[model samples]
Target chain A: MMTMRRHLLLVSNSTLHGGGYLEHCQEHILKFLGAQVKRVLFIPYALHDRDAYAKTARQKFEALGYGLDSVHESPDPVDAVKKAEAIFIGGGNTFRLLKALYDNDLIAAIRKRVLEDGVPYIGSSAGTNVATISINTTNDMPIVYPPSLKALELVPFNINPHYLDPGETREQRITQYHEEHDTPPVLGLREGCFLLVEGDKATLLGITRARLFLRGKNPTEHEPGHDFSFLLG
Target chain B: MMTMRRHLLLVSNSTLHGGGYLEHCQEHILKFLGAQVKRVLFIPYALHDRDAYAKTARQKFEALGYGLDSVHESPDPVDAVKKAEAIFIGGGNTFRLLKALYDNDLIAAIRKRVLEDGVPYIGSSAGTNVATISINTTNDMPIVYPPSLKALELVPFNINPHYLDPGETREQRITQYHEEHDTPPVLGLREGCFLLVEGDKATLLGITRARLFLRGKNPTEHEPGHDFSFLLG
Candidate 1:
């Protein structure tokens, strides 16, 4: 029997309504990374302007007493991932982010560092999407086509970020996904909600709730402090 | 000395909130095809249940005095498109629809019939998406990945169907698309609205207004009966 060691903090959004960037989840961010990790490697390829995206993330991470370096600024992004104490991927567009990961050949490197070495991983929106089995459930428009929809598979399921109850509800879209794919349930992470995973224990954290969808089954709701480790199975 | 002869009815949705399927656009459908076209070749591959989708469309088109036959029931889909008097593609998931179009090898066939042979075409939602330059501006989830996002270039632009005014406005998403590609302006078609394109003339029809977004320019609104023929240039 082999024991898996994986630590992850997947947030639905970087900014909640009426709040600044990462304002709602700053406390969870600090506790998740803990005191051991001194530096964080940032991937800001989701947006069009790398410089602007990187600056926004760096300032927010630095405010929490952590030094942050963006991979876009590095000559070798894979090597940067290899030497990082922690990894943080900010959100923008999921398709653009995954394309950048594939373009830079950092998918395999980041997967090893997080899943094998157990480096702490923090992702918001698009970042959280790639950390799952696939970006097939993303809510963003496909502005650019990536080589494939296959993602890191950090988790055993897919995620729909910023899930809401508006026109053509997120539930309807996820149901359509199951019609094509039977395996790997999808978790609809509503705004102001997140999932915290440490080894075999997974906890739903934040102010809101999440909806879980499985093939051929009606979607069910989940709240904060709920254990979701069974989804790893 | 080449004049393009193209006819299209790109609708934002197949069914309005309170109205029955195709009920709101029945009059436009009848006029767009005219009484000369006796039968319509329907493509219902966007949904998982092609039979059910085809049946719904068949009933609606029948009520409008036009006979409908689905390509899914044909042994050779390309042949169906070749000999069809008119074509109608109902809405479902844009990704699924595009993939099936590629799988059945109907993209080129349908393009020739509409552009070269001047076959009348009617599309709703996902169907309208594939008639444009690409499905990059679609509002549906990418549950399945198509070989490429390139669609039939029946028109000179892309379309975002079911455009609304809530939660991450359609205007914001189109702005992100302009960030990647600066060509082919996108038209945000609201529900109950449709674009009627006949050769050199393009008019905005239906009850609601539409927002047109061009790269490096603020989106402009167009009312019903407004002439959009300039976009064809």
Candidate 2:
């Protein structure tokens, strides 16, 4: 058995309501990475065009005063994860990202680096989806099939990112999921919202409130400043 | 080579806007079944509680002067599918339904019945999802992992049920899907809409328009009376 420190930032989405990409969470991201962290390894497998997606991410992270290197650009993909100062995975299709991670054989390496070496991890949408126990609660279409739905399980619970309240809400979807696999809880992270985890502690931060879906209980709403560290347990 | 007529009613949803379960489409269902169709085999795998779900469907079919037998209740589920005069699969989670179909080893049996034995097939929501080439375009959560994403392939294309146009619309999701797997066109079937297929022909039967998503082409909208038989070819 191995125990390690974990630092994670799981965002619901990249773009905020009525704002440019990552405009809302720029401050939080900077504070989370700090000046000590200089280079960030980006996993762009979720998007269709890895180069185009990486270029956009590179511009954003570079403008934030950090060097961003896409894993697709690396000769040895798994090695990129092992040697990354910090890791960032952007939003897209969860199935695609998970499949690509399996394809590049980087799942174990990335997990070990994030847990043992204490490399900071930041993800949004599909990235946040794969950070959970499984990508069972994603709101995206199943354009592609991964070998399995099992994910990194960095957090004890699962995440339903880019959650909306209208018309067959993500809560309804998670309820059906709970009825199938009832062990782990699910956090319905709304657009512009995110979860920050440091070591064994976790907190919710954003404009809107998030809904927590437990196995048999009614979903509970949590405010932005609320402590979600209990989920780590 | 097994060649047979494919008669299917792929409904976008079981219920219409502001209607009870299976209300608005009751007539369409009856018209599809016609005066001679007596009983139907119901697949309730998509839902958590198959008995309760089947009860509602039983009542609906019973009121229409037909017997509704659930495959779950039979000693041999596959045998029940083989003997079904008509088959009805209700909606819930696409992954769960697909997994159960694989688990029970009934995919081949059901497909043979509908494709070769000339059994009339009816599906709504997750049910509608599996009627196509694959269950890749569904709007449901991946609550369970199916053995494969491939479906009955009764139709050449795929269906997206209960579609709504809002933030990160179904079109955007399907676009990402097209980028990944661009061959099979996707039909965005809104609530109260359905596709009726007889032999090699298909017609859009509904109150609203359906958006067809094709690779390298703009999504085209089809009116209620439009002929969608081209999708079969």
Candidate 3:
């Protein structure tokens, strides 16, 4: 019964992943629960530019007085996760991260630390989406793959981190997708919004509220400071 | 000896799904082939965004006087394939398309039309990538989902679309992926380039040459007009 290692600071998009200002989401994470922000680095995933990619994260966390190191030393990452005060998984593409993590057994190590050692876990975009199995219904695979058919399942449902109505198709697809997949309650976290869960209960811990879609109904839009039963198993 | 349909034009993106003028990848599909284009319709594999999705196929063909009735009716695409002046498939997510197509038998039908009817098929991004069974090297998954191991075996090899040197770590991971799979040829198509195959032979078609990776050998680069059999099976 010790699976409470999920102190998830799941954000919609953090500057950490080039979606917002570095620490854009990270600041809320640290300031919210008063957790110490420590080591950070870009896990290699989608971008064709990694060094350039690493620079984004390096610049952000470095400015905030945290040391950033390339976990590039060895394929084995147990040492990296084990030695960290807080593990911040930045965003990119979940497929790449899962492939690299699973291929290299990093997922197991990270999970053990989080679930066993109770290390604080924070992530945004790809980082946050990886917490669940699917990154919303908008997963344009080949860009990122969800490992196996299952996800971490720590959170009761999935998160559409960059949730927006792209157009008629995207909207309709999301809607129909909700219907066809037996309509699991999907939380549409817009930019600037994030989920902060302590224990199994989660609060919408961002500047704005997100959109919630359910079956046999219209989309329920909520503002910040709102909470829904979607996070409940 | 009717194998499942071979070549297909699966528009995974917003060509048929959007409205008005934007120089859509949908309209220029024929131009990519340097062939005179005609009637077409945006078909929904499983999801329905038909109103916006079908607009271009309806408008473009009617204006050009290729096949006016053909666009709206969508009427037995196999016949259209038999007489199509040219064809084009847009970009979306391959996982989305495959799940639907595989579910509704569209994959087999389209395969029948393209391979048996000899419809000169052209696919972009997802379309081209899915022609093979697995796109193990795609960059989007690790940061998103681990990816569904399921795939469409059109090419039978891995497709590393949109690839370039990211950094030291990625370079190593990608190399490892090559060794692990080793059975299929992984074609890394840079943005604009595509593969032109006639029968069993392939031609490098597009702006720049692509990197070709196969089992037990160094990766090779090829330019347009080069025979595909030199790389593809």
Q: How much is the TM-score of the A chain of model 3?
A: 0.81
Residues B29-88, candidate 1, lDDT per residue (tens digit)? 888988899999999988889999889888888888989999999999999999999999
TM-score of chain A of 2: 0.95
Q: What tens digits encode model 3's per-residue C-alpha lDDT throughout A20-92?
A: 5644566665564353656654454433355666677677767766666645443546687667666666665
What is the C-alpha DockQ of each candidate? Answer: 0.78, 0.78, 0.14
Ranking by TM-score: 1, 2, 3
Candidate 1, residue B82: CA error in Å?
1.6
Candidate 1, residues A93-134: lDDT per residue as tens digits?
899999999999999999999989989899999999999989
Note the residue pairs that clash in candidate 1.
none
Candidate 3 residue runs with Cα over 4 Å from true position: A1-5, A16-20, A32-56, A136-141, A144-149, A166-169, A228-230, B1-45, B48-97, B100-233
List the candidate 2 regions with Cα displacement exceeding 4 Å: A1-4, B1-4
Candidate 2 TM-score versus the reference: 0.95
Query: TM-score of the candidate numbered 3?
Result: 0.59
Report the lDDT tens digits of candidate 3 across residue range B1-233.
Answer: 11323333322233322444223343444443333444443343323344554464457645545543332244555454445544444344445545544544555655555666555455555556556666565433222222354454545566766556551244454555554433566777665455655555556654556777777778887876666565434
Local accuracy of candidate 2 as per-residue lDDT tens digits, A1-233? 12347989888889976787788888899999999999999999998899999999999999999999999999999888988999999988888899998889988888888888888899888999888888888877788888988888789788888777863666677788888755688898888698989877789998988989899998898999889888887
Among these predicted structures, which one has the highest lDDT?
1
Candidate 3 predicts chain B with a TM-score of 0.66
